[PDB]
Amino acid sequence: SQLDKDAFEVLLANCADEPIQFPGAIQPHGLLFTLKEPELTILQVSANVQSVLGKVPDQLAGQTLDCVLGAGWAEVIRSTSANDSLVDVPRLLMSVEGVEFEALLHRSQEALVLELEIQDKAAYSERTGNMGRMLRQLHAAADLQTLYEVSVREIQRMTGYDRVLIYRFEEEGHGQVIAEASAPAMELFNGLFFPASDIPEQARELYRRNWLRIIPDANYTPVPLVPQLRPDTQQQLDLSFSTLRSVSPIHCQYMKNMGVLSSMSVSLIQGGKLWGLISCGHRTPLYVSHELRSACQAIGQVLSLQISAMEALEVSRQRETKIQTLQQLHQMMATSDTDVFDGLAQQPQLLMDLVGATGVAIIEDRQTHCYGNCPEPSDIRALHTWMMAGGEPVYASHHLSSVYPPGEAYQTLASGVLAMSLPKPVDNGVIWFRPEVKQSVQWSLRLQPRTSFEIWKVEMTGIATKWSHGDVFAANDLRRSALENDLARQVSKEQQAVRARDELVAV
Amino acid sequence: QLDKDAFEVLLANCADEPIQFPGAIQPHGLLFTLKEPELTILQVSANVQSVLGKVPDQLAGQTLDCVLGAGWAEVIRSTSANDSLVDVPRLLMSVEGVEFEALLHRSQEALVLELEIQDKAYSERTGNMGRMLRQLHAAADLQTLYEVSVREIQRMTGYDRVLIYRFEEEGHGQVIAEASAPAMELFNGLFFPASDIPEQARELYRRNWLRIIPDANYTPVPLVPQLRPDTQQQLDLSFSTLRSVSPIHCQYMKNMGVLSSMSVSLIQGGKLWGLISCGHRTPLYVSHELRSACQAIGQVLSLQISAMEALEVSRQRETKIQTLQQLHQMMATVFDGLAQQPQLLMDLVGATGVAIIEDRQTHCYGNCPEPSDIRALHTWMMAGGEPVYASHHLSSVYPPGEAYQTLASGVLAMSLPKPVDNGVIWFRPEVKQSVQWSLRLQPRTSFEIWKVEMTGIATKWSHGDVFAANDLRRSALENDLARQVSKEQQA
Ligand SMILES: *C/C=C1/C(=C/c2[nH]c(/C=C3[NH+]=C(/C=C4/NC(=O)C(C=C)=C4C)C(C)=C\3CCC(=O)O)c(CCC(=O)O)c2C)NC(=O)[C@H]1C
Ligand SMILES: *C/C=C1/C(=C/c2[nH]c(/C=C3[NH+]=C(/C=C4/NC(=O)C(C=C)=C4C)C(C)=C\3CCC(=O)O)c(CCC(=O)O)c2C)NC(=O)[C@H]1C
């Protein structure tokens, strides 16, 4: 209908600052209660109480829990809440009015948030053996990529979900799918990149503050919270930590377009930062039991530490190689005995791997020796003069188009440069080149992954992979090695001062 | 007196004990050596005559169904379908009115099977693992991680004492964390020599995750026959849960006051980082579920230690650069300027005394030797000519270095290639200074033996520690070599 689309257009237009932390509604697979701290006085209740527990929500507000959940259950819950910090609380599978309810408790804004999750009747030794199997398989991962596919495949084996993907968030937000174990007759999303605008900052904060996000129904009607605002606090309700939180209609539409209806994502956090996400998707809606989502919560913590451990080892492994090859070039520089830059020119292949690049252009006056994928010599000549205007010793930039506007015709080859030139008056230098990230990636309406990929393409124009701290350190230290050898040649020019006394002696 | 003569023989020769080939298995189980074709019994445990009521001499050389059962032999053959016996689940069995747990592995082309006996007399287990993972995730400092891990393991398995040992650079073991029941001798901070854990034991713990000894006062059961007919050489038990421990370690545990032990190996980068050793005063057996619970902890905890340490390696090395560039900036403004701020020099590499030796005078800062003998120390290193000299055992190669071993046992000095003898020397203290603790195989003797074996050895200079010294000399070299060109500019 025309009325329905009008609200969607406003919501879709303004999605970066949509207050998803205060949805004002919850998913229909649970009941939400706000309880006052001293006497468990009900502040606001989800309108689902009419459907289950058979109580009109108008007069339910302001009364004790005993009025709806019974005296004994309310006493048990009050005893559990007081002086417990609501951390690692054992599951309380209560049963009121013939409906099984799993009770999850937390607190926010000096109030108690109580979630009663309905357990389907149709829906431990086996689970324990599975956890050990997963721990063994994850520990056996020799490489990071092997860890990715092993983890994705075995999560699919555990949960039976029709798709499991792992997104890794790069430096500027953009996420990339790095592993996938999908059910037959489904799309292949491996290698796809999506823009950082696809996930808002509020969503990133919510994923960092939680571990599991479960959306059992994409085609779900949001049950509102009556009253919308808290009576005592005179404000909205904070549902950041609430499992029963309304998802934005934009994301529901996006999930429907992809073909998924039930989703479950496990956050991956390293050092207080969101490394990525483990997205599990299904076609037929399904509800994940407490045992299943307690196991997958433990999966994320194991993976987050394991990924962090291998990331540091890879950093150390490459850094040791950087210092190993840095000494090798220094030895080549000293024993070259031909020119300051000739020794580097003798091994162009080794020069690239020192920093990580695709082409180098070692320059000595009027001779622009270029190796690997590189622009035409005139542009390399042109690019050199721009950096000497600044006078900086080492200049690293992964976005040449936005700092050097004429560096656009060759942005497909030289999108990030790293140049080191000794301060001697004559021209000099070694310039490294990196390609656009968009060239490496190869992947097969709106609110679809196909549209997301194109938006990433138009935003990643002229951006190369960032120069790592080791890469800049490698260039900076090579400058010291070149400078140390350059001043040695200045010592060798004392032979001129040796002959100066010789032709003065004859006089 | 017969045991005393035999026991003392083994004590002298401990580094060559064939612990991988004991020939005996612990009484809490029966081990059968099986052949793939039709499940022929190669070797059978001695206690099969008691628990199973079959003659060990007669039971050798027939089908496993005779002692186990036709259906049980069938299911064993089914699960052991040449599938590497890695992902085998639990196969609870009941033969002759007793309950068994089946373990399978393959050594020297076999199908060796272990039947573990459990005592006749869930949601919390999954919740315990979740709480354990959450608690380690919440930890930030390494010491906090050790404390919380030890406390959590002690709560989970119920053992009276739990300790974490870490193996240092040389090989000696140091107890880092400990959480124990009251009225027992604390062992935190104690150091024991590498001789307590032989190389064979180190390799076996490297190739295993869990090593359990339920009863210390046990009589090993003899494997019969003692030679495999297909190899005529003792059965390889290096991957077997049921394995008789060396009596030296039995005596060690008895003297230390523990009768049940359960050690979880900690492996990082394929190397034995340490051990999580649990001990109980009363013989306490374990269940199948608890074996996997503590096994997973060692895998999880070893992952954090590798990650937490590597974060500290980077953090320490970044702080060096901030200190390194500070000196380089101070260098430009040939050695006198450095004497203004000597404090950051020690923090640059980790030290306690720094000596500046250029031209004639010498400056003594921090805990440093006497200037007279310091000058003698500088004279040696110039003969070698190395740009940097790294050594942690000065008395090992510098015999006069005995009068100031406590003051300085390890040195890291750099000198300039220019002819005039000028350089800077750093010092480290002995390790024994910072370690304090309260044939008599006791922890106290091991600390006494360690103190003897740790004389004159200081903390090893890390790769980053030497790298800072190599970089600092380049800062002095650049200024000196710049003035070398200035010497040309003079004329
Ligand atoms: C400006 C608003 C928009 C928006 C909002 C939004 N997105 C999410 C969650 C997403 N969206 C993802 C986008 C994708 N990009 C891809 O390439 C694919 C599939 C291959 C997807 C699905 C994405 C990965 C997530 C995280 C999901 C997860 O696994 O956790 C949210 C959060 C909603 C919530 O309640 O958590 C919001 C608000 N989406 C848009 O497309 C733009 C218009
Ligand atoms: C020269 C050989 C000897 C020997 C053999 C031996 N020891 C072990 C196992 C040990 N021993 C440990 C020693 C300790 N040092 C201490 O300071 C403390 C306590 C404060 C102890 C217990 C030690 C920690 C282990 C590992 C225990 C574990 O369960 O992993 C073995 C291995 C036995 C095996 O079956 O694997 C051997 C062969 N011990 C000696 O003391 C000397 C004489």
Side-chain angles (χ1 to χ4, degrees):
Chain A
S1 304
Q2 305 176 300
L3 294 190
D4 303 358
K5 309 160 189 175
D6 203 5
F8 202 103
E9 284 326 294
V10 179
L11 204 34
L12 194 32
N14 189 359
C15 64
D17 291 348
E18 167 195 3
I20 58 184
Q21 333 200 7
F22 311 73
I26 78 172
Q27 309 193 45
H29 71 105
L31 275 35
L32 203 65
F33 285 91
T34 46
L35 311 183
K36 200 122 58 182
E37 188 175 60
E39 309 172 1
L40 288 200
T41 298
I42 286 181
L43 293 96
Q44 51 192 121
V45 78
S46 165
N48 232 349
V49 279
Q50 200 80 268
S51 55
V52 278
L53 310 188
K55 181 56 155 294
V56 47
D58 200 4
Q59 317 83 323
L60 197 56
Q63 310 168 357
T64 171
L65 207 29
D66 314 277
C67 299
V68 53
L69 286 197
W73 284 136
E75 161 82 12
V76 160
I77 271 180
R78 150 186 323 89
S79 63
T80 326
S81 62
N83 302 1
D84 211 7
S85 177
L86 301 175
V87 178
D88 301 305
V89 175
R91 47 172 303 179
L92 319 88
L93 191 184
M94 303 170 19
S95 296
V96 54
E97 301 302 316
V99 195
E100 307 160 48
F101 287 110
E102 182 22 78
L104 298 192
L105 268 303
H106 66 102
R107 71 170 26 88
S108 84
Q109 266 160 23
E110 315 286 334
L112 205 62
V113 191
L114 183 127
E115 310 186 295
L116 290 180
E117 196 168 350
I118 298 101
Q119 313 284 160
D120 194 8
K121 312 194 67 60
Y124 304 118
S125 61
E126 177 182 359
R127 296 283 83 178
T128 56
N130 163 267
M131 181 56 29
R133 158 167 308 177
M134 191 87 82
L135 256 295
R136 189 175 327 278
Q137 247 294 21
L138 267 44
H139 200 300
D143 282 0
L144 217 36
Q145 219 64 239
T146 73
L147 173 73
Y148 297 145
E149 322 98 12
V150 160
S151 161
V152 152
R153 155 179 79 216
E154 214 156 294
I155 276 177
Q156 189 209 5
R157 182 177 308 136
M158 158 170 339
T159 49
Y161 269 121
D162 306 357
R163 206 203 267 112
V164 166
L165 306 153
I166 282 194
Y167 312 113
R168 195 182 92 84
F169 293 155
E170 305 159 289
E171 39 185 300
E172 49 249 58
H174 307 97
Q176 155 197 2
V177 197
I178 40 185
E180 161 191 300
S182 35
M186 220 161 235
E187 212 155 359
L188 267 279
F189 287 115
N190 217 327
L192 158 73
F193 284 65
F194 57 80
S197 324
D198 261 4
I199 271 170
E201 281 283 345
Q202 340 285 338
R204 283 212 221 288
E205 198 161 297
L206 293 200
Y207 286 151
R208 262 191 259 120
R209 277 194 256 152
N210 284 5
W211 273 98
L212 254 73
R213 181 109 197 79
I214 288 180
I215 318 152
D217 263 8
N219 280 303
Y220 99 89
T221 88
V223 284
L225 290 203
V226 172
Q228 253 274 3
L229 267 81
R230 317 177 32 146
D232 311 1
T233 318
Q234 305 281 348
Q235 257 273 28
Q236 269 270 31
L237 179 53
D238 182 335
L239 281 207
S240 155
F241 298 88
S242 171
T243 309
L244 328 167
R245 157 155 57 86
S246 209
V247 287
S248 300
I250 324 181
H251 195 243
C252 263
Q253 204 45 57
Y254 193 133
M255 283 170 24
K256 243 170 295 194
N257 291 15
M258 181 175 338
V260 315
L261 296 190
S262 147
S263 150
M264 160 181 133
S265 305
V266 189
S267 322
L268 288 179
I269 323 192
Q270 83 163 8
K273 291 183 54 181
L274 208 47
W275 181 89
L277 259 169
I278 300 181
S279 97
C280 312
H282 218 254
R283 284 172 312 233
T284 301
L286 75 74
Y287 304 96
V288 152
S289 306
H290 177 244
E291 288 81 21
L292 191 43
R293 72 185 178 209
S294 306
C296 261
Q297 177 153 16
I299 272 283
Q301 289 145 326
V302 173
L303 267 156
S304 60
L305 299 162
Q306 175 139 30
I307 286 171
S308 155
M310 302 211 50
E311 275 194 0
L313 171 84
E314 183 185 60
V315 154
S316 281
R317 172 159 325 293
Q318 275 331 284
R319 167 140 177 181
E320 260 156 37
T321 301
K322 248 73 142 183
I323 215 80
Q324 173 273 0
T325 187
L326 216 42
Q327 281 278 352
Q328 179 156 312
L329 266 87
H330 176 278
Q331 174 84 10
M332 184 22 53
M333 273 141 171
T335 57
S336 44
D337 284 27
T338 57
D339 205 5
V340 47
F341 289 129
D342 202 290
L344 300 102
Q346 293 178 300
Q347 217 39 56
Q349 179 47 243
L350 172 46
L351 255 182
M352 295 177 334
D353 283 18
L354 152 62
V355 48
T358 324
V360 202
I362 308 85
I363 168 59
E364 154 198 0
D365 278 48
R366 221 185 175 184
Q367 335 195 90
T368 74
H369 287 167
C370 306
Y371 316 82
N373 291 45
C374 76
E376 304 176 1
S378 178
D379 324 298
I380 308 195
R381 278 246 68 91
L383 185 48
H384 188 25
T385 88
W386 181 92
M387 312 188 227
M388 317 314 278
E392 313 171 0
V394 50
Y395 159 101
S397 85
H398 60 297
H399 208 33
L400 211 57
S401 299
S402 178
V403 152
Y404 184 71
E408 165 107 359
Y410 53 81
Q411 70 178 358
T412 166
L413 282 36
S415 207
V417 302
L418 185 43
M420 144 210 67
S421 66
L422 301 83
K424 49 167 93 76
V426 317
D427 258 36
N428 49 344
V430 155
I431 321 179
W432 289 294
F433 291 125
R434 250 182 165 150
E436 229 181 9
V437 197
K438 203 166 45 192
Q439 301 294 329
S440 178
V441 47
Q442 285 238 74
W443 182 80
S444 312
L445 294 192
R446 73 191 174 189
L447 299 185
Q448 290 201 12
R450 295 195 238 270
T451 319
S452 267
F453 192 22
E454 282 168 299
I455 277 193
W456 176 81
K457 283 191 169 174
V458 314
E459 167 170 356
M460 262 318 105
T461 55
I463 272 294
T465 325
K466 219 203 165 211
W467 302 111
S468 76
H469 263 304
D471 297 357
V472 197
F473 180 84
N476 206 76
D477 217 345
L478 207 68
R479 175 168 174 283
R480 213 221 296 278
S481 325
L483 178 128
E484 168 193 359
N485 267 261
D486 156 79
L487 272 89
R489 299 282 141 139
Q490 290 167 9
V491 179
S492 85
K493 273 178 178 179
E494 280 168 1
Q495 191 57 61
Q496 303 170 358
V498 168
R499 204 61 161 120
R501 322 139 202 177
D502 263 8
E503 285 195 348
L504 179 34
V505 154
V507 166
Chain B
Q1 288 297 138
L2 277 197
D3 290 345
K4 293 180 179 179
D5 309 332
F7 178 52
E8 208 215 32
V9 162
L10 263 182
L11 253 175
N13 229 1
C14 89
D16 71 327
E17 246 196 321
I19 55 137
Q20 309 171 334
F21 301 90
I25 54 186
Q26 296 177 77
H28 64 102
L30 318 87
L31 174 166
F32 309 85
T33 309
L34 275 274
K35 210 178 301 173
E36 70 84 20
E38 59 86 339
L39 304 181
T40 60
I41 287 193
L42 290 131
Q43 297 148 306
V44 47
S45 163
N47 41 14
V48 75
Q49 184 85 94
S50 55
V51 192
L52 272 278
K54 301 299 152 318
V55 183
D57 315 321
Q58 282 202 282
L59 205 69
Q62 306 95 299
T63 44
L64 189 67
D65 44 39
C66 158
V67 70
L68 250 63
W72 286 121
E74 193 39 70
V75 57
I76 289 292
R77 174 181 31 269
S78 78
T79 166
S80 56
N82 293 49
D83 39 342
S84 85
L85 322 168
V86 160
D87 273 45
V88 172
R90 162 92 178 264
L91 317 84
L92 213 161
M93 300 175 42
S94 183
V95 171
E96 300 305 299
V98 300
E99 313 145 10
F100 289 125
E101 171 174 342
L103 271 293
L104 288 322
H105 49 102
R106 175 181 270 95
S107 84
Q108 277 192 334
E109 255 297 305
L111 188 181
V112 46
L113 151 73
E114 327 209 50
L115 282 294
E116 192 154 352
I117 273 186
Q118 325 85 17
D119 171 46
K120 199 173 112 192
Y122 29 70
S123 292
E124 284 175 9
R125 182 169 321 121
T126 59
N128 245 341
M129 181 55 77
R131 191 185 166 128
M132 191 312 311
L133 278 146
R134 205 139 44 243
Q135 228 151 320
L136 312 162
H137 221 280
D141 314 279
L142 253 173
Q143 220 285 334
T144 279
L145 172 61
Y146 299 143
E147 260 175 349
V148 300
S149 158
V150 171
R151 182 212 317 280
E152 284 208 282
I153 299 160
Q154 177 205 5
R155 159 220 73 201
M156 161 195 308
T157 166
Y159 271 98
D160 264 352
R161 143 192 290 179
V162 167
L163 319 98
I164 283 190
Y165 309 124
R166 149 152 82 82
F167 301 124
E168 249 153 27
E169 305 298 299
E170 197 160 13
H172 312 67
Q174 147 202 23
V175 201
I176 305 192
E178 170 186 1
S180 56
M184 296 198 318
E185 182 180 1
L186 287 39
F187 286 150
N188 189 349
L190 167 145
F191 282 56
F192 66 94
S195 148
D196 277 8
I197 311 185
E199 170 137 32
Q200 309 97 327
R202 253 152 177 114
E203 189 193 303
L204 249 55
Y205 296 157
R206 206 160 29 219
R207 280 198 301 169
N208 282 67
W209 273 117
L210 249 202
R211 164 71 141 160
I212 204 189
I213 309 151
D215 181 36
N217 282 311
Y218 82 98
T219 89
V221 317
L223 271 187
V224 282
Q226 293 247 40
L227 283 189
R228 321 217 307 186
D230 39 9
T231 317
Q232 277 71 18
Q233 183 303 329
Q234 278 247 34
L235 152 74
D236 200 346
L237 278 194
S238 148
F239 277 82
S240 194
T241 278
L242 286 162
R243 224 187 63 229
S244 43
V245 288
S246 34
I248 316 186
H249 188 65
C250 288
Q251 174 77 38
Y252 200 111
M253 294 187 323
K254 277 176 273 213
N255 285 111
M256 207 184 31
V258 301
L259 297 172
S260 198
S261 160
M262 191 275 258
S263 97
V264 200
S265 187
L266 279 179
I267 300 178
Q268 73 84 240
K271 264 183 191 176
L272 215 69
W273 179 86
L275 258 183
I276 301 176
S277 200
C278 319
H280 211 31
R281 285 98 67 82
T282 298
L284 162 74
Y285 286 65
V286 85
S287 69
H288 158 205
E289 294 87 6
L290 202 34
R291 274 191 321 91
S292 278
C294 293
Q295 182 178 24
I297 280 188
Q299 305 206 3
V300 171
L301 184 73
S302 44
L303 281 180
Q304 266 161 80
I305 293 168
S306 43
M308 227 84 63
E309 150 143 29
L311 280 190
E312 234 181 356
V313 183
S314 289
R315 156 160 170 45
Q316 253 154 30
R317 98 186 315 168
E318 300 141 28
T319 317
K320 277 181 183 343
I321 289 305
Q322 303 314 298
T323 326
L324 200 43
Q325 270 57 7
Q326 184 46 107
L327 312 170
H328 182 335
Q329 285 185 337
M330 182 54 137
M331 266 309 148
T333 43
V334 293
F335 277 70
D336 211 347
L338 188 43
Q340 271 92 310
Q341 48 105 1
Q343 184 34 270
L344 309 179
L345 264 186
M346 309 165 242
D347 296 308
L348 158 75
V349 85
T352 318
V354 172
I356 299 325
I357 309 162
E358 72 59 40
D359 217 25
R360 324 198 292 279
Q361 95 286 10
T362 302
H363 309 306
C364 294
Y365 300 134
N367 310 54
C368 34
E370 226 276 345
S372 38
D373 50 65
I374 270 172
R375 282 300 314 223
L377 184 49
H378 190 115
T379 36
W380 171 9
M381 303 146 166
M382 287 336 94
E386 294 178 352
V388 300
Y389 172 55
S391 55
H392 39 255
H393 211 170
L394 207 42
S395 317
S396 152
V397 181
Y398 184 90
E402 299 196 357
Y404 41 79
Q405 244 184 347
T406 301
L407 289 192
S409 318
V411 287
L412 181 66
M414 323 75 92
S415 273
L416 260 304
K418 70 188 210 216
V420 180
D421 287 9
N422 74 291
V424 305
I425 308 205
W426 303 324
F427 306 110
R428 268 191 192 281
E430 231 172 4
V431 183
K432 300 165 49 176
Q433 271 322 106
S434 62
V435 173
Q436 306 270 26
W437 185 75
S438 172
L439 285 190
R440 289 180 183 179
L441 310 167
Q442 299 197 10
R444 188 176 177 182
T445 309
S446 291
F447 184 43
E448 284 299 284
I449 293 178
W450 169 87
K451 248 166 71 182
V452 163
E453 214 139 54
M454 211 47 184
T455 61
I457 278 194
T459 326
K460 173 188 177 181
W461 294 105
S462 71
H463 179 95
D465 285 0
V466 190
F467 181 63
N470 299 29
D471 279 7
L472 181 51
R473 71 157 267 125
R474 208 137 60 191
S475 187
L477 182 78
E478 271 316 290
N479 277 187
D480 274 295
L481 202 148
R483 266 145 184 214
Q484 292 177 0
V485 199
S486 171
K487 288 164 192 176
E488 181 265 0
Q489 286 179 298
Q490 181 178 0

